[PDB]
Design an enzyme around this catalytic site. Structure first.
Site, PDB file in Angstrom:
ATOM      1  N   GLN A  70       0.817  -1.206   0.000  1.00  0.00           N
ATOM      2  CA  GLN A  70       0.000   0.000   0.000  1.00  0.00           C
ATOM      3  C   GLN A  70       0.856   1.265   0.000  1.00  0.00           C
ATOM      4  O   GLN A  70       2.050   1.230   0.300  1.00  0.00           O
ATOM      5  CB  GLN A  70      -0.940  -0.001   1.211  1.00  0.00           C
TER       6      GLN A  70
HETATM    7  N1  LIG Z   1      -7.199 -16.553  -7.482  1.00  0.00           N
HETATM    8  C1  LIG Z   1      -6.163 -15.922  -6.906  1.00  0.00           C
HETATM    9  N2  LIG Z   1      -6.385 -14.918  -6.074  1.00  0.00           N
HETATM   10  C2  LIG Z   1      -5.237 -14.406  -5.584  1.00  0.00           C
HETATM   11  C3  LIG Z   1      -3.940 -14.796  -5.846  1.00  0.00           C
HETATM   12  N3  LIG Z   1      -3.038 -14.012  -5.138  1.00  0.00           N
HETATM   13  C4  LIG Z   1      -3.789 -13.179  -4.473  1.00  0.00           C
HETATM   14  N4  LIG Z   1      -5.132 -13.361  -4.696  1.00  0.00           N
HETATM   15  C5  LIG Z   1      -6.234 -12.602  -4.114  1.00  0.00           C
HETATM   16  O1  LIG Z   1      -5.724 -11.376  -3.628  1.00  0.00           O
HETATM   17  C6  LIG Z   1      -6.372 -11.034  -2.372  1.00  0.00           C
HETATM   18  C7  LIG Z   1      -5.324 -10.989  -1.286  1.00  0.00           C
HETATM   19  O2  LIG Z   1      -4.026 -10.879  -1.862  1.00  0.00           O
HETATM   20  P1  LIG Z   1      -2.809 -10.277  -1.029  1.00  0.00           P
HETATM   21  O3  LIG Z   1      -1.701 -11.404  -0.830  1.00  0.00           O
HETATM   22  O4  LIG Z   1      -3.365  -9.644   0.322  1.00  0.00           O
HETATM   23  O5  LIG Z   1      -2.206  -9.110  -1.954  1.00  0.00           O
HETATM   24  P2  LIG Z   1      -0.913  -8.287  -1.472  1.00  0.00           P
HETATM   25  O6  LIG Z   1       0.075  -8.137  -2.713  1.00  0.00           O
HETATM   26  O7  LIG Z   1      -0.265  -9.034  -0.222  1.00  0.00           O
HETATM   27  O8  LIG Z   1      -1.402  -6.820  -1.033  1.00  0.00           O
HETATM   28  P3  LIG Z   1      -1.375  -6.372   0.511  1.00  0.00           P
HETATM   29  O9  LIG Z   1      -1.191  -7.691   1.385  1.00  0.00           O
HETATM   30  O10 LIG Z   1      -2.775  -5.663   0.785  1.00  0.00           O
HETATM   31  O11 LIG Z   1      -0.147  -5.369   0.659  1.00  0.00           O
HETATM   32  C8  LIG Z   1      -7.459 -12.086  -2.176  1.00  0.00           C
HETATM   33  O12 LIG Z   1      -8.706 -11.652  -2.705  1.00  0.00           O
HETATM   34  C9  LIG Z   1      -6.904 -13.289  -2.927  1.00  0.00           C
HETATM   35  O13 LIG Z   1      -7.943 -14.117  -3.412  1.00  0.00           O
HETATM   36  C10 LIG Z   1      -3.715 -15.869  -6.742  1.00  0.00           C
HETATM   37  O14 LIG Z   1      -2.638 -16.361  -7.102  1.00  0.00           O
HETATM   38  N5  LIG Z   1      -4.913 -16.383  -7.237  1.00  0.00           N
END
Ligand SMILES: Nc1nc2c(ncn2[C@@H]2O[C@H](COP(=O)(O)OP(=O)(O)OP(=O)(O)O)[C@@H](O)[C@H]2O)c(=O)[nH]1
Ligand SMILES: *SCC1=CC(C)(C)N(O)C1(C)C
Ligand SMILES: *SCC1=CC(C)(C)N(O)C1(C)C
Ligand SMILES: *SCC1=CC(C)(C)N(O)C1(C)C
Ligand SMILES: *SCC1=CC(C)(C)N(O)C1(C)C
Ligand SMILES: *SCC1=CC(C)(C)N(O)C1(C)C
Length: 180
Positions: A70
């Site tokens: 973020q």
């Molecule tokens: N289908 C699917 N959804 C994913 C995948 N990676 C993340 N998501 C979706 O992304 C959301 C959470 O992802 P995060 O790991 O929190 O994304 P981030 O890059 O860590 O972002 P922040 O943690 O908020 O800084 C959920 O709605 C998950 O379903 C993936 O490989 N496949």
């Protein structure tokens, strides 16, 4: 004596690689890190800070810290504690709307003098989505061919399943091989 003592110094340095996972708050840095580290996909949520993960691969100890992608977290990126040997940039493939944000965000990290020595491995997340963007589009839009001043690569990954995640850790480990 010079060479011998050196070989002794690597004892507390070799066999261990430092990794970092950051980028956008919606890419899925937390999803991938847990899949490769835990081998299974779990309930992911917005990370408000950082999370280290101790994973062993090919006799090596890869440490992957996941810091919030973020905007409010952007500043926290300067608290990595200097140690990450390679970084892992997560860019949503199915999210073309923000596809520029991720690109512009990495640039800030890539333009930092404090991070001019860390790697930049890009992994297109959400590839499992039926409308997942191809490597050709994510690469082109990111100016991958036009960028040859910093060590970075683009790879299509699916965290939901974990396919391609193993290959990523193998590619990085080969790039350093200690000597490098
Ligand atoms: N289908 C699917 N959804 C994913 C995948 N990676 C993340 N998501 C979706 O992304 C959301 C959470 O992802 P995060 O790991 O929190 O994304 P981030 O890059 O860590 O972002 P922040 O943690 O908020 O800084 C959920 O709605 C998950 O379903 C993936 O490989 N496949
Ligand atoms: S790397 C595993 C790890 C270290 C410590 C903080 C002691 N915890 O027990 C976990 C499992 C998080
Ligand atoms: S690090 C290479 C490795 C060790 C061993 C378990 C013997 N396997 O052959 C692989 C390739 C996984
Ligand atoms: S990068 C700053 C820091 C970390 C550590 C490896 C402990 N080093 O000794 C210093 C103090 C340079
Ligand atoms: S990114 C590593 C580092 C930072 C800076 C002081 C700007 N230098 O360029 C080195 C390579 C020492
Ligand atoms: S980082 C790229 C890499 C490291 C090394 C083993 C020194 N090789 O030169 C390649 C290009 C494989």
């Amino acid at each position: 004596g010079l060479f011998a003592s050196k070989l002794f110094s690597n004892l507390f340095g070799n066999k261990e690689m430092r990794i970092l996972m950051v980028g956008l708050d919606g890419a899925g840095k937390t999803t991938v890190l847990y899949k490769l580290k835990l081998g299974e996909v779990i309930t992911t949520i917005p990370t408000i800070g950082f999370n280290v993960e101790c994973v062993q691969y090919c006799n090596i100890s890869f440490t992957v810290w996941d810091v919030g992608g973020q905007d409010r977290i952007r500043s926290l990126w300067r608290h990595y504690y200097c140690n990450t040997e390679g970084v892992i940039f997560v860019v949503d493939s199915n999210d073309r709307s923000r596809i520029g944000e991720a690109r512009e965000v990495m640039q800030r990290m890539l333009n930092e003098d404090e991070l001019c020595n860390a790697a930049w491995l890009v992994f297109a997340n959400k590839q499992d989505l039926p409308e997942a963007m191809s490597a050709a589009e994510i690469t082109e839009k990111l100016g991958l061919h036009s960028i040859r001043n910093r060590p970075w690569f683009i790879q299509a990954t699916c965290a939901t399943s974990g396919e391609g995640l193993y290959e990523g850790l193998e590619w990085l480990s080969n790039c350093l091989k200690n000597s490098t």
